[PDB]
Structure formats: structure tokens, C-alpha cells
Design an enzyme around this catalytic site. Structure first.
Site, PDB file in Angstrom:
ATOM      1  CE  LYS A 218      -8.241   5.548  17.395  1.00 48.29           C
ATOM      2  NZ  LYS A 218      -7.489   4.432  18.005  1.00 48.29           N
ATOM      3  CD  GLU A 224       1.099   7.235   4.247  1.00 46.89           C
ATOM      4  OE1 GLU A 224       0.455   7.444   4.623  1.00 46.89           O
ATOM      5  OE2 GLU A 224       1.455   6.252   3.918  1.00 46.89           O
ATOM      6  N   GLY A 280      -5.287   0.716  15.952  1.00 49.15           N
ATOM      7  CA  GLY A 280      -5.169   0.885  14.822  1.00 49.15           C
ATOM      8  C   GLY A 280      -5.245  -0.959  14.078  1.00 49.15           C
ATOM      9  NE  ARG A 281      -0.476  -2.029  18.206  1.00 47.77           N
ATOM     10  CZ  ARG A 281      -0.234  -0.903  18.415  1.00 47.77           C
ATOM     11  NH1 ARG A 281      -0.163   0.197  17.363  1.00 47.77           N
ATOM     12  NH2 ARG A 281       0.252  -0.516  19.472  1.00 47.77           N
ATOM     13  CD  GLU A 367       1.847   0.823  14.295  1.00 49.77           C
ATOM     14  OE1 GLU A 367       1.766   1.318  13.881  1.00 49.77           O
ATOM     15  OE2 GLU A 367       0.694   0.177  14.817  1.00 49.77           O
ATOM     16  CG  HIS A 398       9.794 -25.085  -1.069  1.00 51.37           C
ATOM     17  ND1 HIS A 398      11.021 -26.393  -1.682  1.00 51.37           N
ATOM     18  CD2 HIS A 398       8.504 -26.051  -0.716  1.00 51.37           C
ATOM     19  CE1 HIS A 398       9.813 -27.437  -1.365  1.00 51.37           C
ATOM     20  NE2 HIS A 398       8.150 -27.414  -0.273  1.00 51.37           N
ATOM     21  CE  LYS A 523       1.831   8.303  10.504  1.00 51.41           C
ATOM     22  NZ  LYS A 523       0.748   8.451  11.725  1.00 51.41           N
TER      23      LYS A 523
HETATM   24  O1  LIG Z   1      -2.670   0.728  14.894  1.00 48.45           O
HETATM   25  C1  LIG Z   1      -2.503   1.594  14.208  1.00 48.45           C
HETATM   26  C2  LIG Z   1      -1.641   2.808  13.716  1.00 48.45           C
HETATM   27  O2  LIG Z   1      -1.838   4.026  14.162  1.00 48.45           O
HETATM   28  C3  LIG Z   1      -1.128   2.939  12.502  1.00 48.45           C
HETATM   29  O3  LIG Z   1      -0.231   2.016  12.373  1.00 48.45           O
HETATM   30  C4  LIG Z   1      -2.610   2.886  11.419  1.00 48.45           C
HETATM   31  O4  LIG Z   1      -3.203   1.779  11.666  1.00 48.45           O
HETATM   32  C5  LIG Z   1      -2.548   3.189   9.912  1.00 48.45           C
HETATM   33  O5  LIG Z   1      -1.948   4.334   9.860  1.00 48.45           O
HETATM   34  C6  LIG Z   1      -3.953   4.195   9.875  1.00 48.45           C
HETATM   35  O6  LIG Z   1      -4.600   5.347  10.669  1.00 48.45           O
HETATM   36  P1  LIG Z   1      -5.694   5.132  10.820  1.00 48.45           P
HETATM   37  O7  LIG Z   1      -6.948   4.434  10.773  1.00 48.45           O
HETATM   38  O8  LIG Z   1      -5.754   7.002  10.863  1.00 48.45           O
HETATM   39  O9  LIG Z   1      -6.040   6.245   8.444  1.00 48.45           O
HETATM   40  O1  LIG Z   2      17.528 -23.021  -4.431  1.00 45.87           O
HETATM   41  C1  LIG Z   2      16.501 -23.272  -4.080  1.00 45.87           C
HETATM   42  C2  LIG Z   2      16.306 -24.414  -3.424  1.00 45.87           C
HETATM   43  O2  LIG Z   2      16.756 -25.635  -3.906  1.00 45.87           O
HETATM   44  C3  LIG Z   2      14.726 -25.002  -2.835  1.00 45.87           C
HETATM   45  O3  LIG Z   2      14.192 -23.060  -2.676  1.00 45.87           O
HETATM   46  C4  LIG Z   2      14.351 -24.905  -4.371  1.00 45.87           C
HETATM   47  O4  LIG Z   2      14.342 -23.661  -4.881  1.00 45.87           O
HETATM   48  C5  LIG Z   2      12.774 -25.243  -4.194  1.00 45.87           C
HETATM   49  O5  LIG Z   2      12.665 -26.262  -2.857  1.00 45.87           O
HETATM   50  C6  LIG Z   2      12.120 -26.093  -5.681  1.00 45.87           C
HETATM   51  O6  LIG Z   2      13.409 -27.019  -6.190  1.00 45.87           O
HETATM   52  P1  LIG Z   2      12.319 -27.405  -7.507  1.00 45.87           P
HETATM   53  O7  LIG Z   2      13.548 -26.947  -8.480  1.00 45.87           O
HETATM   54  O8  LIG Z   2      13.624 -28.771  -7.545  1.00 45.87           O
HETATM   55  O9  LIG Z   2      10.908 -28.100  -6.872  1.00 45.87           O
END
Ligand SMILES: O=C[C@H](O)[C@@H](O)[C@H](O)[C@H](O)COP(=O)(O)O
Ligand SMILES: O=C[C@H](O)[C@@H](O)[C@H](O)[C@H](O)COP(=O)(O)O
Ligand SMILES: [Cl-]
Lengths: 566, 558
Positions: A218, A224, A280-281, A367, A398, A523
């Protein structure tokens, strides 16, 4: 106060006192009892003529409570706020800006929307036409890379609002029959983090000669994004052996800052602009999302996405309060968060396509409404914006549903679709894979509401030792949203629905959903640390670097970091 | 129980004292901050100075851990006692990464390490042979793709580790030309996504399920089998060369058509959410990166295990982290923790921690069934830094207080430093890592805002209250070893909080109700697809809401 947009603070509203009593009444009643009332249940469903079905019966409300909630929305002048938004008033008062994401998707021929004397739809459609032409030419090969190759890869550089929505929509459409065909042979990487690993990931498998870079910011100053843009620039310069003339064919931009884009070397025929009144959002329906989506899928898919968001906009500005889905979801969430004290909302799309929908809703909600003062600067005596999180179903079942069922109460929002983008039905299988999926969508909200009591467990023959461990208290609220299918249009509708619901909540509370002053301090402080790190890397001593002005903790950990990295 | 401990009463008074003080004042005290740092000899640096504690409070926290017998519980865990009492099971994920030649650990009179190492040796040999081409697909092509089928514990940890290693210099070289897709959701879009771009003749399927009866994973496995049968023109004989499995249920694996030389087992004492250091994670990681990378990962988990087992309570990183979390959650009432790794490699680390933490400690009764008088397990979420700063930090800074855990690394897997650039890209990333915690702790008062020229109109809008707590964890680099250390640190911290609370961190009865009810809706849907009318399908027994929405769904999908 004086001249404030909605002066009756929430506690002053006539229905606030009434709603506090409802809370006392409703907390004594279990969902399993409220749901016995079919007449009540039936009047807590809404179903639009363009396919949006919302069921909010699994909420701690009577029809009486709902009437008080609607009255509160009126007392807070939420319908008047909606008109101010749509007519382009500068309701983002702390930045003195309009809030017109809705204009981005008003069709040509719509009633003019004026900001400082100019109809903003003229520029909205001029940009959309340019994206259409540009996307068509890139996709056909009329526009080529520097060495004459077709551009079949896109690196879209942007953070926060400049990618989360877009990546949500991108993945939502990837498996769609028609969208997939149009995207065939084409790839898009999202370069977001300043972590240079993300630069390496974005570059992987991409030949620079066949790759188009979209720089999305923007301000065109985000730290970044600009660092990433210069790094990708450098990658092209390595590829092209230092020839700067090769760069122009591989770069385009999306920003509100044309001085910035030009200084960076991108001319105006490669900049697809947007406006300060697009947060932005809330920017995915501007060039921010429409360009990369149009590049991947063609302009037609992007246009249908816009039409769907527009459909939901028309609903928001014309449906009566009690029939208005965004108002309704806004009211229900304020009821759960502010009156019942539930701090979190679980966003639970039963669609792998919507893998990154919760991540986008997390920014949009947190936000916007993670604020501590009203629009006019008064300190709120209570927490406002909820913490939103989620993963698609059935995955989440799960992962964290254990907690949602037997631990802290987390109001849930289940989102589903009637038809699959890629249906499977095996001959030997009792049900289609989509039906198996959806068996879960329909079962989970009832499990949360009804629970399972010790009495029932005993009748089932559970030993007494295990009864408490297997008890399900229930009484846990949920909404169910259900759409026909995952089309561009329904993705637009769902987006706009959440965009408006966030607005509704912000207006109920009297905050500014549209600024984000809370990101500034980080920032500023990081820029100071950048300077310190530079000096140490240059070989200056700690007393010379500026680090001595930082607290002792940061002093020590910085030093550890420099020592481990030198 | 918790409230009966002497230190609980003491900590209730600490909380009253501490809520009147601001971190901006506490952090002026350098002697204090200095004792709120730990640094292990395998490179893990933890700073918990930005917490609403004095050295007194911390002593009280340490005492509470003793009073709750947290150290005795560690010993019960490591020796293989059945401390998951509701399922009568040992809890022996630490066994998974005990090196060959460790002292025996017994369950039911049997040294479980014999089986742990036998499966590990078989994974080494099997992975070597697939990767080298000594084992080929049915048509003799080298297998270069993996579809790993599994949900919950059977993939979230594995996907965390996988992406954490993907850009590592040596691991990437070993993974070059190799691809892996995780098929988790029963949504048939995920099947299409898993199969996409993979030729079945060069693709190996790993079916991962502790029980080998999970609804989604089995339907997925059947759907992928069908995809193979269509490619190979209905020839059953072609399937054996393309399938292997990880499970505790060998009757189920055989019955699916997978013979024991393509099953790499684990055990009932490995919880799903603690399973990534078993075959669950070690097989697909070894396939993608080669066994050596998987072993170094195991060695790292093991280093942190030894730390957990031996470090004194006050020096013990998992205990300290667990104590601080209970302080925030239980005593200060903060319901959420943000997990914030400053590493794109750790993109899916929050998601794994989300399961580990919430599925373990999202409970309402003690181990022996007493109803708790308060909420326990926190709600964990997160995204990597810096992404999260532009998503939800606005709220973390000015809205609801959310204790934060910042994780960073001293070196990058893919360092960039531009000539024209003041700092390296990693240093830019890290500038944020160092800045954010201090932004949260100190904030920015109206007075300071006035001194900087902010108009009085905007002062409230631009105020940062501060006083928001955080921990900083810094490792040397994103190596398989440090990934292992980070994983085990979190596994043990979750266990610590469970024992402090008196809960079972290791069962998950909370998932059964949805499964039973979904099975019923499945049957109703079948009957409706088969032409039974609404009054003939079983629908009539559901609440009105569900009857209506089910009929909408059938109408719209007819
Ligand atoms: O709602 C958006 C916020 O202002 C901010 O969190 C933004 O989305 C990003 O930082 C990207 O910013 P630019 O588009 O200015 O790079
Ligand atoms: O700690 C993990 C829970 O028991 C559960 O989240 C499990 O991880 C999944 O439901 C898959 O289980 P299976 O490996 O028996 O498919
Ligand atoms: Cl919504």
C-alpha cells in the site's frame, strides 16, 4: 460526543440493561433444553436467495434475547453506519479516510460514490480494465519475459493484508473445475516473510525468464516487502549477469504510492493502483488480490469473485436488521464475547480448499477490533475484539476439538458446502467422500450443544471410574453456515460476509475497525535494533552500538546472538 | 491437589502484589533480569524476564512444582509406569529416541527398547533401499514421491518437522528430486491435491494410523488404493510394491493387504500428538531426507529429554516454561498463548503445538475424576514472525493480553546479505524478534507520546499500555538436532502443566462424541441417497435445526 457518529456508548443503550438480565436468565438454561423449542429454532435460521444458509439456533438466546440484540443494533445506529460506509463518508476518523472496500466490487453503472468530489468508481473500473488487459496478454504470451519466454510463474511479494486474503482465495479456487483448467501450467508463490528462507522458497523451481514479479504494498515502504523486492531484483540481476535492462519485463506493482513504485523502477503501465480507503485486511477485492488471481485463473474467475462479494454487499445494505446475516453474526459474537465473556472464536471450514481462510479471518478480526479505545478516544472498561483461530474440518477435530468439547468454551463457526470441487464415490462405499466429510459438519455442532450426561453414560454401561472422564457438559454454542459449492461467487460472498460482520462488531462497540496504530511501536523499535546490529557487524563495540540504552535482558540476548552468529 | 499446596496460597498473594506493578519497573532491576535467564550447554537460551514475577514469586513457583511432585512424575514417565491411568498405559515417547545401548525400560516385563530399535533399524534399511532404487515400484521405476496418509497426531508433527528441514542445506540436497504430500482431510479435495502431479508408478503410499480404523485415514487409504487400481488396470498384484503402513494394529494392516515387512510399528504408549519421534514421523522423514537426518532429529529430542530428566527444578527449561504458563493462565487468568517462531521454516510449528497443548490439557477433571474448579489448558495459536506482526499483533499490543513465546535462531538456513543493504536479511528478521518483546513489556505512555508531538486527539489511539508478558527462546540454527530439542521441550512443558494441574495430559475422550454422532449422520445420509424419505431415514430423531439443514443439504446436492 460532540458530533460523534453513534453517541450512546454500549452501557448507555436502553437494551444493555435488558441484555445483562437476559444473560443472567440464559446462563441458567442449557442448549439441550432451548433446542427442544422448534418454533424458536425455526426462527433462528436465515437463508438468502443467493444460496447463503445460516443457522444460529445453538446460541444462548430466546427470541426475546434476539429482539433485544436487534434493538441494541438500532440504538448503536448500525444501519446508519452502514449508509455512511457505502456513501463514502470518512468513518475511519483517526486517519481521516473513507472505508470503501465495497466500491471495489460495485459494478460499472452503479450510483456514483464521491470522495473529495471525485467518483471513485471511475478509477476502480479503470484499474480493473487494465488488470483484465494485462492478465490476458501475460497469459496468452502477447507480453513476454526479457528473453521472449511466456511468463508462466508469479512471485507475489507482500505481507499481511497484501497476501493473506489473496492466498485464502487462491487455494479456495485451486481445485475448482473451471479455475483449475484456466490455471493449468501456471504457478504462484507468495513471498511474505523477510526471513530469507521465504525468498529461497519463492524462487524454488522458477526460471527467472518465465517468471513475473508482483510487488504489493500500500505504502510501498513496508520493510519486509521492499527488502524482498530488492532481493528478488538481485536474483534477476544474477540471472541476467548484471544487465539492468532485463528487469523491466519481469516486474509489476500494486500500491497507492506511485512515487515509490517509480523510484523502484516500475513505470505506470506496470503499476495497478489502489486507494487509501482500502484497508490492507480489506484489500483482496482491489488490485491486491485481483491482479494475482487474474494472472493465475484469468480475469473471468476474478470477476465472478467480485460479483459474489457485491451480492453480499447489497444484502448488507438492504436486508432488514433481523434478516441481515452480517448484522446477525455480529450481534451473536458480541453477545458471546462481551456479555458471556468468551474471548475466542473457532473458524471451522469443512473444506480443504479453505485451508487458509482461518488465517485471513484472524487478521481481519483481530487487527480490526483488537482495540482499547473508542473512535473518539475514550478508554473501554472491557475487552472487545475476540481472538479468532482455526483449521479446516475434519482436520481440527483431531487437533484442538478435545479442548472445545471438554475444556474452555469456544464459540464455533462451522462453514460448509453442499457440493464438492472434486467428488469421489467408490462403488463399494456406503457414502461419497463428501458425505463422509459432511457427516462430521452436521454432527459436531449437536455434540457441542447437547453433550452427554453422566446418566446417559451409566445407561450405556460406562464404568463409574471413567464416567467423569467421558462426560460432555455440552451447552457450547455454534453457528452453521452452508453454501451451495466453492465457486468464485460463493468465495466472494463468504469474504464479504466476514468483512461486514467485523464492521458490525466494531460499530456495536464504538471502536475504529479500520485503523491499526498498534503495529507502529514494533516497527520503530525494530528499526533501532537494525541500527545496533549494523554497528556490531561493522565491528563497533557494545558501548558504541547504541545497545546500552536497551534493557539488560535485550542486551544479553543480543550479545549471545552476535557471538553465535559472528 | 493444586489448591491444597502451601505454595498455592502463597502464589495467590503474589498475584495480588504483582498486578499492581508494571514490567517497565520490574525490568529496571538488572540483578532480577539476570536470574530470569537460562542457557543450556546444547545451545538453548531462554529468557523469561518479561513476566510478572519477582525472584520471590519464582521461588514460590518452584516450590509449587515440588509440592505437586513434578519431579517424581518425570521419573514415573521415564521408567515406564502407567501414568495415563484412564487408559492404563505407559507414556513413553521418551523411549522413542533413547539411543541404542541405553538402559532397559520395562512395560509388562519386556524391554520396550528392543522393539523401538528394531523398527528404527528396519526404517533405516527400508528407506536406504527406496532412496537408492534397490526397491522400485511395480513397473521398476525409482520411487520419488510419497503420499503420507494420516490425520491429527499422524501428520501435524511430521509436517512441522518436514517444512522445518526443507530449506536446510544438507537436508535439501538429500531431498532433491523428492516430493511428499500429506493426505489428511477426508474431504476428497485433499485426495485430489495429494495425487496431483504424481505418477502412481513412481509414488509410495505410507498409511499412518495408530488404530488403523480412523474414519478419514481409512477412507483416504481406500481412495488412494482405488487410484492405483485404475492406473494399473485393475491388477491387484501391482499394489504391494506401492504401499507401506505405520500403526499399532497389525490385524488391520494385514487385512488392508499390507504384509509385515512393509509395516513399521509403534506402541500403545505413544500418544498420537507425541508420535513424531516414532515410525509415524521417522519413516516419512527418513524417506524424504534419508535416515541420518531422522537420527540427528532423534538425538536432539534425546538431548532435551536428558535435560528434563536431570536438570534441577530451577534450571529445568520445560518445568520453568510450564510453571510460567500456569502462572499466566491459572493465576492471572490469561486463556491464550501465542506461539511465534521467527522462522519461515517453522510455518507449521504453531499448528502442531496447538494440538499438543490443547488436546493434552483441554480437560475438566483430574486424573482420578474430580471436577476442576477452574479452566486448565490454554488456547494456543500462532504464525511465524514476521508474518504475524501484520496479522494479529495489533490485538496482542493494544487489545486482549496474550502471553507470547518468541522463538528464534542465530543463523539462517539460507543467508542473504545484499551489498547495497545495511543489514543481512536474517538480521532484519531478527531485529523484529528482539524488538517485539520489549514493545510488549514497556509500551508507550501518553506522556511520552506528548513529548514526541502526537496531537492530543490521537494520543489515546496511539497509547500502548505495555505490561504484556513474553518468553524468548533462541537456538543456534535450524538443524535436525535443534528441531528435536524444540519439539521435546514443548512435549515436556505440556506434561509439566498437566501434572501441576492434576489432569491426564495423555488421554482424549473429548473426541469420541463427534465420531459416534457423525457415524449416525452417515447412515441417515446413505438412506437419503438411497431414496428413503425423510421419515424413513432416521432423521426424525435429530433436533429440528439439524433436520432442516440436512434436508437443505440433500436438496442442494441432489
Ligand atoms: O490492514 C493492513 C495493515 O495496515 C497491515 O497489517 C498491512 O496489511 C501489511 O503491513 C502490508 O502493508 P503494505 O501493503 O503497506 O505493505
Ligand atoms: O493424540 C492424538 C489423538 O489420539 C488423535 O488426535 C489422533 O492423533 C488422530 O485421531 C489419529 O489417530 P490414528 O493414528 O488412530 O488414526
Ligand atoms: Cl461472519
Amino acid at each position: 460526543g460532540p458530533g460523534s457518529m453513534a453517541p450512546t456508548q454500549l452501557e448507555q443503550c436502553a437494551s444493555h440493561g435488558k441484555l445483562l438480565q437476559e444473560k443472567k436468565k440464559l446462563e441458567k438454561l442449557h442448549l439441550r433444553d432451548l433446542l427442544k423449542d422448534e418454533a424458536r429454532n425455526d426462527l433462528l435460521i436465515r437463508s438468502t436467495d443467493q444460496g447463503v444458509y445460516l443457522d444460529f439456533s445453538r446460541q444462548k438466546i430466546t427470541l426475546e434475547t434476539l429482539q433485544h440484540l436487534v434493538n441494541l443494533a438500532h440504538e448503536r445506529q448500525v444501519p446508519a453506519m452502514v449508509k455512511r460506509m457505502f456513501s463514502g463518508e470518512k468513518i475511519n476518523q483517526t486517519e481521516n479516510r473513507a472505508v470503501l472496500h465495497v466500491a471495489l466490487r460495485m459494478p460499472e453503472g452503479s450510483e456514483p460514490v464521491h470522495v473529495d468530489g471525485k467518483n471513485v468508481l471511475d478509477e476502480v473500473h479503470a484499474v480493473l480494465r487494465r488488470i483484465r488487459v494485462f492478465s490476458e496478454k501475460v497469459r496468452s504470451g502477447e507480453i513476454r519475459g526479457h528473453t521472449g519466454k511466456k511468463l508462466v510463474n508469479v512471485i507475489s511479494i507482500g505481507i499481511g493484508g497484501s497476501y493473506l486474503g489473496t492466498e485464502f482465495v487462491h487455494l479456495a479456487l485451486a481445485a475448482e473445475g473451471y479455475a483449475a483448467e484456466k490455471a493449468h501450467g501456471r504457478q504462484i508463490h507468495f513471498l511474505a516473510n523477510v526471513d530469507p528462507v521465504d525468498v529461497w522458497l519463492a524462487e524454488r523451481g522458477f526460471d527467472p525468464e518465465e517468471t513475473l514479479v508482483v510487488v504489493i504494498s500500500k505504502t510501498f515502504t513496508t520493510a519486509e516487502t521492499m527488502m524482498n523486492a530488492r532481493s528478488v531484483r538481485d536474483w534477476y540481476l544474477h540471472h541476467y549477469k548484471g544487465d539492468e535492462r532485463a528487469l523491466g519485463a519481469h516486474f509489476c506493482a500494486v500500491s497507492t504510492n506511485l512515487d515509490g513504485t517509480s523510484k523502484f523502477g516500475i513505470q505506470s503501465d506496470r503499476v495497478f493502483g489502489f486507494w487509501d480507503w482500502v484497508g490492507g485486511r480489506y484489500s483482496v477485492t482491489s488490485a491486491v488480490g485481483i491482479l494475482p488471481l487474474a494472472l493465475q485463473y484469468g480475469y473471468d474467475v476474478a470477476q465472478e469473485f467480485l460479483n459474489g462479494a457485491h451480492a453480499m454487499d447489497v444484502h448488507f445494505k438492504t436486508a432488514e436488521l433481523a434478516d441481515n446475516l452480517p448484522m446477525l453474526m455480529g450481534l451473536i459474537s458480541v453477545w458471546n464475547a462481551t456479555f458471556f465473556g468468551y474471548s475466542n472464536v473457532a473458524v471451522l471450514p469443512y473444506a480443504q480448499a479453505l485451508l487458509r481462510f482461518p488465517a485471513h479471518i484472524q487478521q481481519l478480526t483481530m487487527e480490526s477490533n483488537g482495540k482499547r479505545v473508542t473512535m473518539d478516544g475514550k478508554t473501554l472498561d472491557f475487552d472487545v475484539g475476540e481472538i479468532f483461530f482455526g483449521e479446516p474440518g475434519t482436520n481440527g477435530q483431531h487437533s484442538f476439538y478435545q479442548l472445545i468439547h471438554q475444556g474452555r468454551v469456544i464459540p464455533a463457526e462451522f462453514i460448509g458446502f453442499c457440493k464438492s470441487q472434486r467428488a469421489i464415490k467408490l462403488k463399494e462405499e456406503p457414502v461419497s467422500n463428501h458425505d463422509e466429510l459432511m457427516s462430521n459438519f452436521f454432527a459436531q455442532p449437536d455434540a457441542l450443544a447437547f453433550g452427554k450426561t453422566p446418566e446417559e453414560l451409566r445407561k450405556e454401561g460406562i464404568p463409574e471410574k471413567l464416567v467423569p472422564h467421558k462426560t460432555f457438559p455440552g451447552d457450547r454454542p455454534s453457528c452453521m453456515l452452508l453454501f451451495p459449492e466453492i465457486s468464485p461467487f460463493h468465495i466472494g460472498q463468504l469474504l464479504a460476509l466476514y468483512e461486514h460482520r467485523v464492521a458490525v462488531e466494531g460499530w456495536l462497540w464504538g471502536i475504529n475497525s479500520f485503523d491499526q496504530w498498534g503495529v507502529e511501536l514494533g516497527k520503530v523499535l525494530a528499526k533501532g535494533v537494525r541500527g545496533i546490529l549494523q554497528k556490531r557487524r561493522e565491528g563497533k563495540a557494545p558501548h558504541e552500538s547504541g545497545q546500552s540504552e536497551l534493557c539488560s535482558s535485550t542486551r544479553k540476548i543480543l550479545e549471545h546472538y552476535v557471538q553465535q552468529s559472528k
